[PDB]
Amino acid sequence: AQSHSLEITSSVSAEKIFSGIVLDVDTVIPKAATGAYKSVEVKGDGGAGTVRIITLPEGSPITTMTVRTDAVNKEALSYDSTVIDGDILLGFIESIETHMVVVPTADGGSITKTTAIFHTKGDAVVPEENIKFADAQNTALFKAIEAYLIAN
Amino acid sequence: AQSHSLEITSSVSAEKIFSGIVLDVDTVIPKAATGAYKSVEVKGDGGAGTVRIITLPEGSPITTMTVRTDAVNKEALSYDSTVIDGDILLGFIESIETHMVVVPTADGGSITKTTAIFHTKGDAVVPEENIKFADAQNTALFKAIEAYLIAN
Amino acid sequence: AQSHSLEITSSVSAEKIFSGIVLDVDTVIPKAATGAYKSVEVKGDGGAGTVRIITLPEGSPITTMTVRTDAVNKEALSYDSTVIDGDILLGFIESIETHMVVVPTADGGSITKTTAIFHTKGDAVVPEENIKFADAQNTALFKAIEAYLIAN
Amino acid sequence: AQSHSLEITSSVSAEKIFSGIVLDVDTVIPKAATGAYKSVEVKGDGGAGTVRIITLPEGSPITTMTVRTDAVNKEALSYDSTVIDGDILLGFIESIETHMVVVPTADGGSITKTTAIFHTKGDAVVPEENIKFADAQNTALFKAIEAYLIAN
Amino acid sequence: AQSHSLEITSSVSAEKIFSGIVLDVDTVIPKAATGAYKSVEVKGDGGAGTVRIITLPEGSPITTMTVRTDAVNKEALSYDSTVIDGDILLGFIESIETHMVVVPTADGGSITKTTAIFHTKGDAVVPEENIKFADAQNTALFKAIEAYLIAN
Amino acid sequence: AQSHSLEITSSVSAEKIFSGIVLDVDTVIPKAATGAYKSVEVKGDGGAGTVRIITLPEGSPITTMTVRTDAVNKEALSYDSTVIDGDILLGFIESIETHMVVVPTADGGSITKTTAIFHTKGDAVVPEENIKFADAQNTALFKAIEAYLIAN
Ligand SMILES: [Cl-]
Ligand SMILES: [Cl-]
Ligand SMILES: [Cl-]
Ligand SMILES: [Cl-]
Ligand SMILES: [Cl-]
Ligand SMILES: [Cl-]
Ligand SMILES: [Cl-]
Ligand SMILES: [Cl-]
Ligand SMILES: [Cl-]
Ligand SMILES: [Cl-]
Ligand SMILES: [Cl-]
Ligand SMILES: [Cl-]
Ligand SMILES: [Cl-]
Ligand SMILES: [Cl-]
Ligand SMILES: [Cl-]
Ligand SMILES: [Cl-]
Ligand SMILES: [Cl-]
Ligand SMILES: [Cl-]
Ligand SMILES: [Cl-]
Ligand SMILES: [Cl-]
Ligand SMILES: [Cl-]
Ligand SMILES: [Cl-]
Ligand SMILES: [Cl-]
Ligand SMILES: [Cl-]
Incomplete structure (x- = not known):
């Protein structure tokens, strides 16, 4: 099953990054990345389901x-989620299963690792250009949030 | 004179990055980072002055x-510019002089290297938190543009 | 809180290294580092607790x-664990909290990144010689396991 | 059009490097690289033409x-020049168009970037060995001049 | 003639590493890597022959x-030796000629470089997996010895 | 004891660089750096002493x-030598002990790593400007030789 990983380094602590990009994401993103989203419907409290x-x-x-959020662990700073619908799936991706962990670094900062697993119909391969696009855009959003955390 | 540097790595080529983050920035940013700016008044053609x-x-x-744009070198992929006004200067920064160069990498990607020099009144020091904020936000915008370049 | 990091590079892939030094460690170490341990009592299945x-x-x-194992993430290739007892704590270390992540490299190899945080009573500092010793010994064991993985 | 870039790092400042390798080159080279040149005829004052x-x-x-010097900018530390004759052109290079900029670095040093564009008859390609040779020899001369600047 | 080199970095000084991995190896290994060897017959004093x-x-x-030890130089920290028998030769390696030097580093540490030259019958090539295995295992033993030196 | 290291990267292989800057230096330098030296008196064959x-x-x-050449290892590509006389010692340096190793790189190029140790009378320190000068000049000569190797 085709997979990819993305590592993003930050000088901000693991606890604080996790709070920004997982726990408080729904109130943080509108202040941090003001136009990034057109709208967000949230069904649930932020935990699994x-x-x-x-x-x-x-x-x-x-x-x-x-x-869909599959799992949250506030103590371990891990988050698992799956992309299950949208034009992000192109014509042929059944789902994008993702697993994220935020690990601390000796300098008091952190590394946010994400592994994505692409479930496709048959032998269909997700092209490298689409994966690079996702990485750029996820990094853009991460860093916008990092900026908000450094200032608040 | 207090100074700081920021390096951003990209898998996109040096020529292409430079076109996105310097040459075509005024038409690219509204498509790439739709809400980042409230408004931009541009006086001049993009070259020095x-x-x-x-x-x-x-x-x-x-x-x-x-x-202010101080210099553009399309062939060398370098860009020099100075922040001369705004609440970005806090109470006490006279100007932020910046020098950027985009250099190619063996893998066909690039590193964008920026040096910022802070001119302040007296011995006043620009705090580390404000510099980190700038780095986060500039990286966020860089990567939003990288995403647009990978897709177009 | 005093901290330290250790990075170990390998030509073996991230998935494979993680399986050797975390998932299958209890059957691998007796075959890979035959005399390293005198004995191991394992209480639990290898997951948290x-x-x-x-x-x-x-x-x-x-x-x-x-x-103690605090957390395992098989998908993200991260492992968190804490040293809680033994003469390794010298007279005065309350615990050694560690966080490990195995990240892939462009060449198909990996870097195993570990951060150790030393919790001590009062202002007591763990000397550099003891930290270097730990690094040497952990690297020795890592590489003995790498050897076993390359051969099997 | 075939092109190549060369980046040389130095601990010497951008202003000072530029003065050595562009502005004062005609008096510096005989003191810095005593035997490098057999002779130099200079027609003009060092500016364009x-x-x-x-x-x-x-x-x-x-x-x-x-x-031939195409352009000098003393304020921006940029220099543009073209190789228009000599056995350096081998049998088939019409001209080697070059563009150089010296940019400052946070540490008070500099990076000298040069982009070379090779104009050839038809589809003729300049071999990699000839480009590496040029890079070695230009770096050799640069560093001889760096040495002279550090001492004077 | 097929060849390979291995470089191992250490924070321990060149004199001290050399004493551990060459001069005193016969008494150090049983204390440092307690189970690594099943047995060692030594014929000679540790010098050539x-x-x-x-x-x-x-x-x-x-x-x-x-x-077989071919040459020792205690002043230069160099050691030359040849593997001349054993299942390490697989079916077809006539001998593995090795040359090692331990060089000091500005930080007070050292780099141990080893060059191995594989003499084989005909055009037979030693596979990359076997060379990686050797590197892992030699590094494992090196680091076990480094650990012993840091503690004694 | 005061020390310093210099690393020089090259696209030329380790074997070839070593032959140019150590083994064949006496015939190479007059062809490669025609005016660098006024004269050289060589007493010995190039090996130790x-x-x-x-x-x-x-x-x-x-x-x-x-x-003085202290040691040469043709197989390991290492060279040790000591500066023992001359106005290079300024008023007060007793000797400059150097240790060089050329190590190969994955791309088929090399890194030449040199460590210099300055032995001085009393607490006398060798100033940073003199060390930078030496680095510039040694790099200049290295690269002139690299140029000759690429062409021959
Ligand atoms: Cl895959
Ligand atoms: Cl990957
Ligand atoms: Cl923080
Ligand atoms: Cl599947
Ligand atoms: Cl500063
Ligand atoms: Cl900085
Ligand atoms: Cl591209
Ligand atoms: Cl100033
Ligand atoms: Cl610390
Ligand atoms: Cl550390
Ligand atoms: Cl593998
Ligand atoms: Cl604490
Ligand atoms: Cl090209
Ligand atoms: Cl290039
Ligand atoms: Cl200067
Ligand atoms: Cl053309
Ligand atoms: Cl070979
Ligand atoms: Cl090799
Ligand atoms: Cl030591
Ligand atoms: Cl042979
Ligand atoms: Cl020192
Ligand atoms: Cl140094
Ligand atoms: Cl070569
Ligand atoms: Cl001394």
Whole structure:
């Protein structure tokens, strides 16, 4: 099963990053990345079973994605979620299973590792350009949130 | 004179990154980072002497900055510019002189290297938290642009 | 809180290294490092809450250590564990909290990144010689396991 | 059009490097690299339109090159020049267009970036060995000049 | 003639490493890597002409090797030796000629470089997996010895 | 004892670099760096005990240096040598002990790593400007030789 990993380094602590990009994401993103999202429907409290229907602006390469939270561990700073619907799946991705952990570093900062596993119909391969796009955009959002955390 | 450098790695080529984050920035940013800016007044063609008056949304930690372009070298992929006004200067920074160069990497990607020099009144020091904030936000914008370049 | 990090590079893949030095460690170490341990009592299945009582040979500089597993993430290749007892704590270390992540490299190999945080009574500092010793010994064991993985 | 770039790092400041390798080159090279050149005819003052006819010693792989200055910017530390004649062109290079900029670094040093563009007849490609040779020899001369600047 | 080199970095000084991995190896290894060897017959004093018959535990991928010392230089920290018998030679390696030097580093540590030259019958090539195995196992033993030196 | 290290990267292989900057240096330098030296008296064959009396042109910041070869290892690509006389020692340096190793890189190139140890009378410190000068000049000569190797 095709997979990919993304590592993002930060000088901000693991506890604080995790709070920004997982626990408090719904109130943080509108203050941190003011126009990134067109709208977000949140069904659930943020723990397992929570489903978010996200919509990006009209012209964007990806306009819609639906993301289900599979597991949260506040003590271990880990988050598991699956993309289950939207044009993000292109014509042929059944689901994008993701597993994230935020680990501390000796300098008091952190590394946020994410592993993505792409479940596709048959032998269909997700092209490298689409994976790079996702990495850029996820890093963009991460860093916008890092900026908000450093200032608040 | 207090100084700081920021390096950002990308899998996109040096020529392409430079076109996105310097040459075509005025048409790229509205498509790439749709809400990042509230408004931009551009006085000039993008070459030396060009002055941009930038305004961010109401709540933001930095609401206004005025940036002058000192030099552009399309062939060398370098860009020099100075922040000369705005609440970005806090109470006491006279100007933020910056020098950027995009250098290619063996893998066909690039490293964008920026040096910032802070000119202050007297012995006043710019605190580390404000520098980290700038780095986070500049990286966020860089990566939003990288995403747009990978897709177009 | 005093901290230290250790990075170990390997030409073996991230998935494979993680399986050797975390998932399958209890059957791998007796085949890979035949005399390294005098004995191991394992209480638990290898996941969170698992506690290992380890004893090294009679003369060794460290003769006993008790290590608790705090978290395992098989998908993210991260492992968190705490040293809670043994003469490894010298007279005065309350616990050694560790956080490990195995990250892949462009060449198909990996870097195993570990952060250790030393909790001590009062202002007591763990000397550099003891930290270097730990690094040497952990690397020795890592590489013995790497050898076993390359051959099997 | 085939192109190549060379980056050379130095601990010496950008202003000072530029003065050594561009502004004062004609008096610096005879003191810094005493035997490097056999002779230099300089037609012009060092600004745009200046043409230098350079001759290296009898046995050298490259014996002659003629270099025209296209542009100098003393404030921006940039220099543009074209190689227009000599056995450096081999049988088939029409001209070697070069663009150099010296950028400052946070540590008070500098990076000297040069982009070379090779204009050839038809689809003729300049081999990698010839480009590496040029890089070695230009770096050799740069560093000889760096040495002179550090001492004077 | 097929060859390979291995570089191992250490924070321990060159003199001290050399004493551990060459001069005092016969008394150090039993204290440092208690189970690594099953037995060692040493014929000679440790200088040129010395021959060691080494046997590893029953299951190991390599069970036997015979190593001849070709040259020792205590002042220069260099050691030359040849593997001349054992299942380490697989079916077809005539001998493994090795040359080691321990060089000091500015930080007071050292780099131990080893060059191995594989003499084989005909055009037979030693596979990359076997060379990686050797590197892992030699590094494992090196680091076990480093640990002993740091503690004694 | 005060020390310093210098690393020089090259795209040329380790074997070839070593042959140019150690083994064949006496015939290579007159072809590669035609005017660098005024004269060289060589006493010995190039191996241990060899002593070179070197004289640079009249004006140069360093006019004379006497260098003894302490050790050569052709197989390991290491070279040890000591500067024992000349105005290079300024008023007060007793000797400059150097240790060089050329190590190969994954890309088929090399890194030449040199450690210099300055033995001085009393607590006398060698200033940073003199060390930087030496680095510039040694790099200049290295790269002139690299150029000759790429062409021959
Ligand atoms: Cl895959
Ligand atoms: Cl990957
Ligand atoms: Cl923090
Ligand atoms: Cl599947
Ligand atoms: Cl500073
Ligand atoms: Cl900095
Ligand atoms: Cl591209
Ligand atoms: Cl100033
Ligand atoms: Cl600390
Ligand atoms: Cl550390
Ligand atoms: Cl593998
Ligand atoms: Cl604490
Ligand atoms: Cl090209
Ligand atoms: Cl290039
Ligand atoms: Cl300077
Ligand atoms: Cl053309
Ligand atoms: Cl080979
Ligand atoms: Cl090799
Ligand atoms: Cl030591
Ligand atoms: Cl042979
Ligand atoms: Cl020092
Ligand atoms: Cl140093
Ligand atoms: Cl080569
Ligand atoms: Cl001394």
